[PDB]
Amino acid sequence: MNIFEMLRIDEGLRLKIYKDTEGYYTIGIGHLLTKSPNLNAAKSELDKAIGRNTNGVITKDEAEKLFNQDVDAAVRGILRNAKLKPVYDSLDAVRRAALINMVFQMGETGVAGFTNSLRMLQQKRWDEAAVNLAKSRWYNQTPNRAKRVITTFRTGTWDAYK
Ligand SMILES: [Cl-]
Ligand SMILES: [Cl-]
């Protein structure tokens, strides 16, 4: 298991514009297109993203290409963030995957806001971090995906994904 397979599981793959759990226009492997309610603002962002007139539909390769950029951007955002970088540096390889997953889902800003959990992770208090992470809108809104990521942080194994 690796970060790509992990996120492919959490996000799925859709080749036609769809609405995410929050109601936003997305395509591929969790690639957010726009927060705007207008399908046309979505198609426009899509075509801009792909470099062709897609009429809201893309191929598997196009989806994978977006996915590659997005994982890469997630890592780089972590590395450039003063609050996140130290956490990531302190973690083992599996737990690093767990942080990247939160960032991809909620952006750097969101994650960086989990001050207390972050501190617990850095200190390696796994059980305590897992309890604090669960006290979040995130967990309440997407409980199954949240439990999987949290177990990953608690255990340092890929069990929740196997
Ligand atoms: Cl893009
Ligand atoms: Cl869920």
Side-chain angles (χ1 to χ4, degrees), residues 31 45 48-49 66 69-70:
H31 180 82
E45 286 300 303
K48 177 156 55 90
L66 293 180
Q69 293 170 174
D70 291 349

Side-chain angles (χ1 to χ4, degrees), residues 85-130:
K85 180 184 191 291
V87 185
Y88 189 82
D89 280 348
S90 76
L91 294 178
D92 59 277
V94 181
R95 295 180 168 94
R96 282 173 183 179
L99 187 69
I100 296 172
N101 188 312
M102 294 185 69
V103 166
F104 180 100
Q105 190 183 353
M106 78 193 112
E108 173 203 331
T109 309
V111 183
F114 288 53
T115 305
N116 308 336
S117 307
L118 291 173
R119 179 185 92 254
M120 286 163 222
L121 295 168
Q122 196 170 353
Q123 307 175 84
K124 317 203 174 277
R125 298 162 138 76
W126 320 122
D127 290 20
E128 314 161 43

Side-chain angles (χ1 to χ4, degrees), residues 37-146:
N38 186 286
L39 179 68
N40 288 303
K43 292 167 153 218
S44 172
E45 286 300 303
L46 183 57
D47 288 343
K48 177 156 55 90
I50 302 305
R52 76 191 186 64
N53 235 86
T54 62
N55 206 19
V57 176
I58 66 172
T59 64
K60 190 176 179 100
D61 294 349
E62 279 170 350
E64 285 168 347
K65 184 153 198 192
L66 293 180
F67 188 41
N68 284 332
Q69 293 170 174
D70 291 349
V71 172
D72 182 63
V75 178
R76 279 178 304 82
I78 283 158
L79 303 168
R80 275 195 271 102
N81 184 290
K83 273 91 165 306
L84 293 180
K85 180 184 191 291
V87 185
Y88 189 82
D89 280 348
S90 76
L91 294 178
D92 59 277
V94 181
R95 295 180 168 94
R96 282 173 183 179
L99 187 69
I100 296 172
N101 188 312
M102 294 185 69
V103 166
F104 180 100
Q105 190 183 353
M106 78 193 112
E108 173 203 331
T109 309
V111 183
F114 288 53
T115 305
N116 308 336
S117 307
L118 291 173
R119 179 185 92 254
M120 286 163 222
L121 295 168
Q122 196 170 353
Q123 307 175 84
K124 317 203 174 277
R125 298 162 138 76
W126 320 122
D127 290 20
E128 314 161 43
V131 168
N132 182 270
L133 278 166
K135 295 178 174 156
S136 58
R137 171 182 195 274
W138 173 58
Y139 181 83
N140 287 103
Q141 297 309 119
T142 47
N144 296 320
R145 169 177 190 161

